[model samples]
Target: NIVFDVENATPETYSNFLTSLREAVKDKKLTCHGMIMATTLTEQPKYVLVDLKFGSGTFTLAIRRGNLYLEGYSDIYNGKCRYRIFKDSESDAQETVCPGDKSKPGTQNNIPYEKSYKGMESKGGARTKLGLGKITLKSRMGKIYGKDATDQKQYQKNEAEFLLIAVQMVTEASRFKYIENKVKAKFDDANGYQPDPKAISLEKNWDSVSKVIAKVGTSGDSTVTLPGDLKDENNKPWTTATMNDLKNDIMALLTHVTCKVK
Candidate 1:
């Protein structure tokens, strides 16, 4: 594992660290085979940072966030190396030096690119996945999640309301990430979590309804068949026999719930 010497570090200290890192990489003191580009502090000017790859496509170190964000094709779609330098913390130190990996001092390993960002290879590490944007949904009970990257069509107001009503009626969490994580137990195939084909089928049908609803004038007249093995946030399967209870709860949320009015 890599440790940053960030004791007694201020915004300038962090900024200077990047300069040292650049020099190290330039002078062959650090090993990064991928492209190293200058960072833009266009918006958040409080900290100095850099984007480079020690082992992934590109990872960013932000002194402001106190976390290392690994970017995939783009975005925080990868694993993070979480470190902090908050004041008054026993764990916080003021080592103002950039030390390479301790196991092999002055040498850095070139980590190969991974499609998914699995936190450091150890116990209880957080893992992240790509393409989640397409699978995730909006939490608003009246609006449908927007269309895919390539799709030009937008869901009409009524269609959005109906799809949200249908989906929110089945799932407990307002956010898709919460429901998806609960179904797969957080990590996906990128890490150790195995694919639940039942959930896949359910999501496939759910997505189909969203797409089909985009073309309809009224919510009730959509041609797409609803998901068959409708599962709750806990991954409990809801079948025709027990669907009425689910239906009643959904109706209750739609009509009686005040907090869901957004």
Candidate 2:
């Protein structure tokens, strides 16, 4: 079965997609599609589910109203769909084996170290690459950053657009930035406090990747699925539109922050 997590919940779309993810992950029911997501207006968490299995096939991203999806095809060719969106929750975090600082004779575990919560992090996105130093789906777009459109092949289109969305959201309109701002307001009420300028910059440049740490606990989320209404073509155009909106929203968020600082 496919293990997963839902961090940074937004609207009802979280419930919807979780329902779909569980059903598909348990049985080999939804073969044609792999990870799924919610929509724009109703906006769910910025988590893009990907296939770990190596293979060659079509990489898919389906927008089911308020949730978004980036479903990678499981074939030797299609491999890991490059892009991602990271998140977190109120549970235990993950750890990674990090190189211990040799300069410090006394460090965690001496020679090496464990980085706390290495898996689930709130971060940004880009036109990321595939395995072994190969640029993923690059064509004239040339490694797209925040808010860009490139003529990717059919296999790459859906996931690429989703990447754009994730990148734009993290850099421009990250919920982290939003929540942090509110937290700053609370801290300001205390004896002496101010939002760290570095924190602002960090949120503006979030570059974390989303992945399954472990299915250890219950997410308390009910999953969802696509509407019985739309077909493939009809479902595609809005994918681009949603990213544009994300771009606009990011701009708006930045402008607001700047004005407030003024």
Candidate 3:
């Protein structure tokens, strides 16, 4: 698992993260293997803190509100059907960067280039230490062709919403991580009291909804279905259902009333 220290995270935002994630990936923006990166400074000189990526199709987009920067190789169409960074005004930027006709994307001659800049480290400073971006590398085995690229669109509004989702992901994960320590603290404070069995257990009662999950779109809608243990009050998998594993397991990994929203 990856970890990030997010800034400006309120519980309010963390609660809203799952939906934000859904919104982020739902519309299927940027089929390419880049990410939605942001730099939100309460104050700025209007210069982009995050530089664009390298390679043929690299371009940078930085907005004002929080200063979100979207850059990197963009493949709009089919997988590997990539496009080159077609600059709007190409003379100077093209020579130093990817050279190509600015008239359109997927036309630049450079397929891969080198790094442009080294990043910064924000720690123990006023700089918000959380929320940056997500990274997922793609396999280079696929072919990337400019001709395969064409007119593509992005939902800026949705993209902006997902920016929060990404930020929330970092904060929520950090929050979740500490819960384990909290449980340990609880045990330590109890002075090693009699360890009572869990208030609820699969061995004790089969809770179909508690231990099962499935994704489906049966009702014309993508849904998460849950059915508790699929057996009676005995060791069983089905009728007379007899089954029990040796390495018995399971944690917020904690307990919430009950619901999986996403």
Candidate 4:
């Protein structure tokens, strides 16, 4: 049974749907909706109980409100499986894989808790092809340091933004270094540390600082979704409102740090 409209559900909306599913199963006898099903218990139990079926075997899970637990493995310890599946408020979902039954010492070798779960991670043929890459200093720095010049307008814009973020990040790092090496080294402990030249530069160029590592883009290409909740709408807004909020929070960090040095 289709619990809700899965097709049109955005990531935020899907999480909302999970919230509903948890409520639906809590204090209820038994409920099954398509591949998802849940139940409740009398005594101290997990928030919800879920049973999931894979090709040959089954995965049963005890879902806790705070986190996730392996219910199926617990069942085997008592006598059997279900999979409790839920996403964290953050992107990554935490899973606790339980050890096999400890009662039977040698028989523990027979329990394949890790191996059995391999089937769960098996791949489906590709309908989506998104290149996953980390946005580390090395990666971003590579783009900024590239010697070749591009005539492409968006490429030019991309490099300029990269240079902007790069300089600020480097400036932040250099500011800390200056305080430690210059301020502490030259001045006595009694004297208060003052802001370095970079700090003032960072403050003056705070608009550049606000950009940070938030913006992501590609030149000339129309649109594509990146990791997390970043989506493509029109000619790439360069940053989403969500991301702008994140940058603002990050910008506030610099504000406080710079002021503290002052």
What residue runs in model 4 are displaced by over 4 Å at the alpha carbon?
Answer: 1-20, 24-47, 67-262
Candidate 3 lDDT by residue in tens digits, 1-262: 1111123223443334422422222223211111121223343422221122223332222222122222222323343323332223223333222225244333332322221111111111111222222221001102222333221222222222222222223222222322222222332221211112221122122223222321221222223232343332233442221111101122112111122322
Q: Any idea how many clashes model 2 has?
A: 24
Q: After superposition, how far is residue 174 of candidate 3 from its true place, in Å?
A: 14
Where does candidate 3 have its weakest 10-residue lDDT segment?
115-124
**Collision count for each candidate, in order:** 4, 24, 18, 11
Q: Write the per-residue lDDT of candidate 4 for residues 5-102, one digit (tens) a residue.
A: 32232334433434454443432332111111123233244334332222233223333322222222221222321111211111111123232422
Tell me which of candidates 1 and 2 scores higher on TM-score: 1
| Candidate 2 structure quality by residue, lDDT tens digits, 198-221 | 333324332220111011122222
lDDT of 2 at 70: 25
Taking every candidate in turn, the Cα RMSD to the unseen true structure, in Å, is 22.3, 20.6, 19.4, 23.7
Error of 2 at 129 (Å): 24
Error of 4 at 199 (Å): 36
For candidate 3, what is the lDDT? 0.24
Name the regions of candidate 1 deviating beyond 4 angstroms.
1-70, 73-195, 201-209, 220-223, 226-262
lDDT by candidate, in order shown? 0.25, 0.23, 0.24, 0.27
Better model by lDDT, 2 or 4?
4
